[PDB]
Amino acid sequence: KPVWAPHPTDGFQVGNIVDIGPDSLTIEPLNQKGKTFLALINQVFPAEEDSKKDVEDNCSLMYLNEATLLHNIKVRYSKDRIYTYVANILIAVNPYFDIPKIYSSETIKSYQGKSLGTMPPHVFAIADKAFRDMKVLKLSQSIIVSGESGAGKTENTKFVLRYLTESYGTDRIVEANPLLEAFGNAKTVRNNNSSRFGKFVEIHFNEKSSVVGGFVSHYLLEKSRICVQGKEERNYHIFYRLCAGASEDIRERLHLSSPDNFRYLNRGCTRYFANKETDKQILQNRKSPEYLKAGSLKDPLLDDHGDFIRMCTAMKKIGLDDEEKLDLFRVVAGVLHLGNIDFEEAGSTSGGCNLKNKSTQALEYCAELLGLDQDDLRVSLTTRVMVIKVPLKVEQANNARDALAKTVYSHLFDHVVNRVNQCFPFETSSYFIGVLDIAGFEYFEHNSFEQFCINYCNEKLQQFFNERILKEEQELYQKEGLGVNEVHYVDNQDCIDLIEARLVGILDILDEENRLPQPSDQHFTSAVHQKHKDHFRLSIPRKSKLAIHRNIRDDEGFIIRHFAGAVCYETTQFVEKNNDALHMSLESLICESRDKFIRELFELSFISVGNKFKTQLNLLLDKLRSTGASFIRCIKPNLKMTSHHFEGAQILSQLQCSGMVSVLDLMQGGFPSRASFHELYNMYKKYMPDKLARLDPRLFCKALFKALGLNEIDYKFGLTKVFFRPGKFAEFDQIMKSDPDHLAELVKRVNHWLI
Ligand SMILES: Nc1ncnc2c1ncn2[C@@H]1O[C@H](COP(=O)(O)OP(=O)(O)O)[C@@H](O)[C@H]1O
Ligand SMILES: [Mg+2]
């Protein structure tokens, strides 16, 4: 009798239907006799009879729908059970605090070799199932960890890596994380430890299924962050870890000071993450005036001083020598000092510029740290070669300085990722388990090239999700004659082609612009609109429903009609953001550095960022399409980074946008485990007496399952394979186990049953 009906902030609320009208149901909220509200018929769902129970697999619910799924994960979350299955897919709700012992070495050991469902839902069980599938099927595997910014993708990715290396090893793969996060993570409004690059981490195994090494692929490091941030955000953690934690000897060698002293840090938040203890370990000369007034930033995970110490320990553990450590820090400090080089107008018509007299020290420190001559650096930032050496305007000098900073830092990040790969190499491997941790679809008031690339990535990955979860799965069910109700989808190749098609795609049109004598963002934007006037996925910014886009000219942006939502991209800076290469004069200044480390970072100048990413993404998709896939859907419970605060409407929105709601019936009515009658019969054959061997493979399988007490609630026979339903992984694993004693025992049971 009680049903779930909409609620503005909780998503759904309990009530009883008291009336029906055209396209409406009248709902009486539970225990509020007399009070009523209207709800659309299609927005009212049946509720589970027992409101207090919780199930480990949502497929176990009598009435699985968006409302009962939300309630089940809510009840579990209230009891610190953050992990729940939907058959073999895992839902992980971010707790925003450390739940005691759930990631301990004892917990890790408890998950080893256990069938899904034998143990409580956990990220370790997804990792173990991928390992078991890898070993049994002799097929590499991918674990895709998805969700909103701050949902827990990076934390769950780290739990998977720790589980696999601790269980199936003979520590560097785990130890590499603090190093990569130092250079590629930063505080954003949505996450204090936001990943500003995407990654695919592979753990490689030998023929005995033991760890031999790893490989990290990195994507789209955010360059804009290097030079300026929003007042509540920070630059990359490394800058603050260095300022908070460096010894006075290092501070002096690098000419470091409190973060408020650097243009590249001082528009963002200049405070450190610290607690009462670590704040006393940070020296007074590292603290900005805002830190001394407002106090430290608080986080349960991050600690700038503590993290610097842990990073140095990680560097030692991985084999990074003390010399390489200082080489990395010198580049980081060189980029900070570069940012302090300021310019002033020069010329009777302000056509040129000069370094401000106050910037003399910054020029000196920067040149010293980057191994450059002060004069060549000053000249390269204030003039342009076209031979002919002409003055730059102040705005152009600021751009040249910032371009050099962004390129040096991005090359340093490429160096760090490569150095980490060199710490766990392998000459050969039989298979791998790869973990994908990349940002999904996102949009803000202002969307630029960074959002354009991430949303393009999302179109391609969404297509992979559709092809694997819906297309391939249902084609198997249909071919096998299973009669599973079909879930349809609309393919997005038209959106992918708009962005990436050769010659006509937006990325190619943008590259065309970078190669022109006088590149222009406006010329690029007009070329897109002119080429794609008939494309239903593209529109001018004036077509938008929002007031913020009313002033955007046709050549100043474009709208992409992604199925996830229409996004208006402002095209200013698309041409500059699309170039990974430095101008020839800055490139030569940096390639000719006195410092070997600097020359080694760099060992018409144009490298397409868009097409570099397209090639990388295609290599990633080649790997995903050729491996088995497991999915973890991370959920962010609130926008306040707080524990025990479940925002039902926000969580419901994520469950809907992720596509999880659209597949609930397909997963519940699906068959995640299967084997052919032939492979089963062939495995048992040698143990069979004649009476069993004489049976056709399908008939032997039927006798085996009946003897073991299995029924239609556990399995269904297809044309060539047996299929096991959700919540039947343990039963399937028993049938599949190839140990001679185990096979002989099951045959003994079948022989006894048959009599
Ligand atoms: N299972 C977890 N246990 C403890 N804290 C967690 C857990 N998952 C996430 N967090 C917290 O949430 C923050 C954001 O998680 P994160 O993995 O960085 O998000 P994402 O990578 O999806 O942007 C973490 O820095 C941490 O404070
Ligand atoms: Mg992350």
TrEMBL record:
It is a peripheral membrane protein. Mg(2+) 3 binds at T154, S195, D437. Keywords: Actin-binding, ATP-binding, Calmodulin-binding, Cell membrane, Cell projection, Coated pit, Cytoplasm, Cytoplasmic vesicle, Endocytosis, Golgi apparatus, Hearing, Membrane, Metal-binding, Motor protein, Myosin, Nucleotide-binding, Nucleus, Phosphoprotein, Protein transport, Transport. Residues 617-639 are annotated as: Actin-binding. GO terms for biological process: endocytosis; protein transport; sensory perception of sound. ATP binds at G147, E148, S149, G150, A151, G152, K153, T154. GO terms for molecular function: actin filament binding; ATP binding; calmodulin binding; cytoskeletal motor activity; metal ion binding. Signal peptide: none annotated. It comes from Sus scrofa. GO terms for cellular component: clathrin-coated pit; clathrin-coated vesicle; cytosol; filopodium; Golgi apparatus; microvillus; myosin complex; nucleus. The keyword Cell membrane applies. It comes from the Eukaryota. It is found in: Cell projection, Filopodium; Cell projection, Microvillus; Cell projection, Ruffle membrane; Cytoplasm, Cytosol. Residues 1-49 form the Myosin N-terminal SH3-like domain. The chain holds residues 5 to 789 of 1266 of the full protein. Belongs to the TRAFAC class myosin-kinesin ATPase superfamily. Myosin family. ADP binds at N94, D98, Y103, G150, A151, G152, K153, T154, E155, N191. Mg(2+) 1 binds at T154. This is Unconventional myosin-VI. Residues 53-737 form the Myosin motor domain. Mg(2+) 2 binds at T154, S195. Its main location: other.
